[PDB]
Design a protein around this ligand. Structure first.
Ligand SMILES: *[C@@H]1O[C@H](CO)[C@@H](O[C@@H]2O[C@H](CO)[C@@H](O[C@@H]3O[C@H](CO[C@@H]4O[C@H](CO)[C@@H](O)[C@H](O)[C@@H]4O)[C@@H](O)[C@H](O[C@H]4O[C@H](CO)[C@@H](O)[C@H](O)[C@@H]4O)[C@@H]3O)[C@H](O)[C@H]2NC(C)=O)[C@H](O)[C@H]1NC(C)=O
Ligand SMILES: *[C@@H]1O[C@H](CO)[C@@H](O[C@@H]2O[C@H](CO)[C@@H](O[C@@H]3O[C@H](CO[C@@H]4O[C@H](CO)[C@@H](O)[C@H](O)[C@@H]4O)[C@@H](O)[C@H](O[C@H]4O[C@H](CO)[C@@H](O)[C@H](O)[C@@H]4O)[C@@H]3O)[C@H](O)[C@H]2NC(C)=O)[C@H](O)[C@H]1NC(C)=O
Ligand SMILES: *[C@@H]1O[C@H](CO)[C@@H](O[C@@H]2O[C@H](CO)[C@@H](O)[C@H](O)[C@H]2NC(C)=O)[C@H](O)[C@H]1NC(C)=O
Ligand SMILES: *[C@@H]1O[C@H](CO)[C@@H](O[C@@H]2O[C@H](CO)[C@@H](O)[C@H](O)[C@H]2NC(C)=O)[C@H](O)[C@H]1NC(C)=O
Ligand code: U5P
Ligand code: U5P
Ligand code: NAG
Length: 161
């Protein structure tokens, strides 16, 4: 099964999370990851015109001012081509995932990486995914802030349940 992961806004974290805060973006798709990682010559080189059709996904690179298409192309190259075989169904899934993320807090949202904010005493979530996973930078016993939404645990749904 595919892991869907995304970035969340945080002015306290340099890079994409800061660029997101400035542009009023809450969630920005990082990738959709099957188990197979692509290696070798891609079956199609992704174009800027193709990658821009993933609406609302922000590049993690400062060089494009956090727009398009360094991260988008990296994702196609490392996780896309050998798994989707054709760019069209891949762009459509990526664009639809971002459209869903743009609507707000997803049904399943689990913290991946945090920046613990001493001032607010919160785990400000900087990256999240649709399934639970071991945490990075999340302070034990502290509540979680997912682009402004306060959650008591790492997920917004019970994982025992
Ligand atoms: C979003 O997040 C960013 C990053 O943390 C915040 O930006 C910081 O804001 C503070 C407060 O305005 C800045 O502090 C001031 O730094 C001055 C020196 O800055 C240097 O220059 C580079 C730019 O080339 C900075 O990026 C570096 O940080 C350098 O250190 C410093 O001179 C200044 O002091 C003066 O003001 C204070 C009061 O604010 C006085 O008490 C003091 O005596 C003196 O007069 C500040 O300390 C900080 O530099 C900014 N950081 C960055 C990386 O940009 C934003 O505030 C956050 N935005 C929101 C909306 O919350
Ligand atoms: C989770 O991630 C996996 C990838 O690991 C996704 O599965 C891929 O889904 C895409 C569709 O979104 C599939 O692409 C289509 O593949 C057709 C050929 O596939 C054959 O069948 C098996 C799978 O049962 C493959 O493994 C073989 O290699 C076979 O070749 C292909 O013909 C088709 O292209 C046609 O349509 C497109 C437009 O839709 C045209 O552009 C094109 O010219 C052509 O007419 C698609 O490329 C892909 O096969 C799937 N890969 C695997 C390994 O299963 C899941 O969908 C993801 N699921 C979720 C929920 O995220
Ligand atoms: C975007 O969100 C919609 C709505 O939650 C998802 O659509 C659901 O898909 C499942 C099957 O995967 C259906 O059983 C539901 O009926 C659908 N709901 C609606 C309201 O259409 C969709 O899968 C999401 N897309 C992606 C790519 O994440
Ligand atoms: C980004 O997320 C924040 C936090 O959930 C959203 O802000 C909420 O917006 C509603 C309606 O505007 C207010 O009633 C709430 O008080 C807000 N919550 C907080 C904590 O500020 C914001 O709307 C989202 N932005 C986008 C573009 O979807
Ligand atoms: O979508 C992204 C890509 C990168 N990073 C951050 O930027 C760091 C390094 O930049 P790079 O190795 O991707 O070039 C990553 O380890 C992570 O801390 C993100 O938060 N989101
Ligand atoms: O299945 C995956 C793929 C990637 N990552 C993490 O996401 C970041 C970038 O993945 P990538 O999209 O560049 O491959 C890396 O820190 C990597 O550890 C995962 O946790 N699981
Ligand atoms: C991409 O998603 C947007 C919503 O963010 C939607 O308006 C558009 O139709 C989608 N593009 C497609 C389906 O090619």
């Amino acid at each position: 099964e595919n892991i869907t992961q995304w970035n969340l806004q945080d002015n306290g974290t340099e890079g994409i999370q800061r660029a997101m805060f400035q542009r009023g973006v809450n969630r920005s798709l990082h990738g959709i990851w099957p188990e197979k990682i692509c290696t070798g010559v891609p079956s199609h080189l992704a174009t800027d015109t193709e990658l821009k059709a993933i609406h609302g996904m922000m590049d993690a690179s400062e060089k494009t001012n956090y727009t398009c298409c360094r991260l988008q192309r990296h994702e196609w190259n490392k996780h896309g081509w050998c798994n989707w075989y054709n760019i069209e169904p891949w762009i459509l899934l990526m664009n639809k995932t971002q459209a869903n993320l743009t609507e707000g807090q997803p049904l399943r949202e689990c913290a991946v990486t945090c920046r613990y904010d001493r001032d607010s005493d919160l785990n400000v979530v900087t990256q999240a995914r649709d399934s639970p996973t071991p945490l990075t930078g999340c302070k034990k016993g502290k509540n979680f802030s997912f682009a402004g939404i306060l959650v008591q645990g790492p997920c917004n749904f019970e994982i025992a349940v």
